[PDB]
Amino acid sequence: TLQQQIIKALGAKPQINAEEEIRRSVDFLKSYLQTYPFIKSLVLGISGGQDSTLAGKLCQMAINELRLETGNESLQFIAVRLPYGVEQDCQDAIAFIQPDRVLTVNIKGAVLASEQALREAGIELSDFVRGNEKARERMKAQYSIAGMTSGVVVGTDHAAEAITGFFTKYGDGGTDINPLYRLNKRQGKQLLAALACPEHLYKEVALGVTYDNIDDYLEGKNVPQQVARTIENWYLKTEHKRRPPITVFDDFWKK
Numbered sequence: 001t002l003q004q005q006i007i008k009a010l011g012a013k014p015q016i017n018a019e020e021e022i023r024r025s026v027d028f029l030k031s032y033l034q035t036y037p038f039i040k041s042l043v044l045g046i047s048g049g050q051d052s053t054l055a056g057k058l059c060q061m062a063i064n065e066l067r068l069e070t071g072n073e074s075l076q077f078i079a080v081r082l083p084y085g086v087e088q089d090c091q092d093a094i095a096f097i098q099p100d101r102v103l104t105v106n107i108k109g110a111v112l113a114s115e116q117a118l119r120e121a122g123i124e125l126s127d128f129v130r131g132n133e134k135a136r137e138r139m140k141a142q143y144s145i146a147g148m149t150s151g152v153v154v155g156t157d158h159a160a161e162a163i164t165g166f167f168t169k170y171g172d173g174g175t176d177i178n179p180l181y182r183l184n185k186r187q188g189k190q191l192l193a194a195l196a197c198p199e200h201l202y203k204e205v206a207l208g209v210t211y212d213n214i215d216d217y218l219e220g221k222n223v224p225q226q227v228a229r230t231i232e233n234w235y236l237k238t239e240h241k242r243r244p245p246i247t248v249f250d251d252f253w254k255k
């Protein structure tokens with residue numbers, strides 16, 4: 001079935017062991033850094049939300065262990081705050097993660113400058129497109145930081161986000177390494193609980209579909225037809241976001 005097909009593609013499991021998944025992600029990050037020694041930093045945008053809070057904690061753990069085990073003091077986890085103009089949740093998240101370094105880059109100026117350039121070209125952006133434009137400016141800032149600190153950009157994408165394609169293409173979807181990929185929303189909460197994360201940091205989505213509906217679907221459970229159809233629709237519609245640019249050799253799009 002299509003549901004079983006999606007579950008397999010995203011690597012989702014019905015249930016997981018929190019401790020095991022935490023270690024899987026941490027050792028994944030550690031192993032990558034050990035394989036490419038020229039990498040000295042992990043860069044991640046912090047928003048105060050569940051996903052980035054979890055990913056941030058895992059990145060700092062990976063760095064903490066590597067520094068102790070290798071004695072390499074040049075390794076660092078860099079948390080980046082990317083506000084659009086003008087924090088409590090972000091501040092609480094930062095206190096929980098305890099990142100080596102915190103940078104704050106206000107993206108408003110660049111976004112306004114981009115729109116002025118487009119306006120002079122005769123193009124006026126809608127609030128909707130502006131939202132994706134902001135996500136791409138955030139991607140730009142993180143890659144510029146990575147470029148100057150010999151780092152890689154960590155992403156927060158996971159199964160509950162990938163299934164609907166609810167991320168900006170080459171925006172927050174533009175990252176180098178995604179340690180949360182495979183986990184659904186509630187499973188992310190499970191890991192945060194095991195990490196003793198402040199409860200208020202992790203506790204609808206669209207067309208009457210909630211995260212519980214999405215997680216149940218990903219866990220192989222039976223959900224209402226209306227819900228299942230909406231989910232599967234979003235998935236098929238956004239396949240282009242989960243693959244590299246389309247070439248004459250691809251056939252996944254042919255109907």
Ligand SMILES: NC(=O)c1ccc[n+]([C@@H]2O[C@H](COP(=O)([O-])OP(=O)(O)OC[C@H]3O[C@@H](n4cnc5c(N)ncnc54)[C@H](O)[C@@H]3O)[C@@H](O)[C@H]2O)c1
Binds near residue numbers: 168240
């Ligand atoms: N109802 C909801 O809750 C809902 C629904 C949809 C999107 N969103 C949100 O909106 C943002 C995503 O917006 P979006 O996906 O339009 O913008 P996007 O930039 O992520 O994707 C749109 C771009 O992808 C390319 N594209 C579109 N269709 C294509 C196709 N069939 N083949 C190849 N390329 C194609 C085009 O360049 C198009 O401009 C996210 O924040 C997402 O969460 C929310």
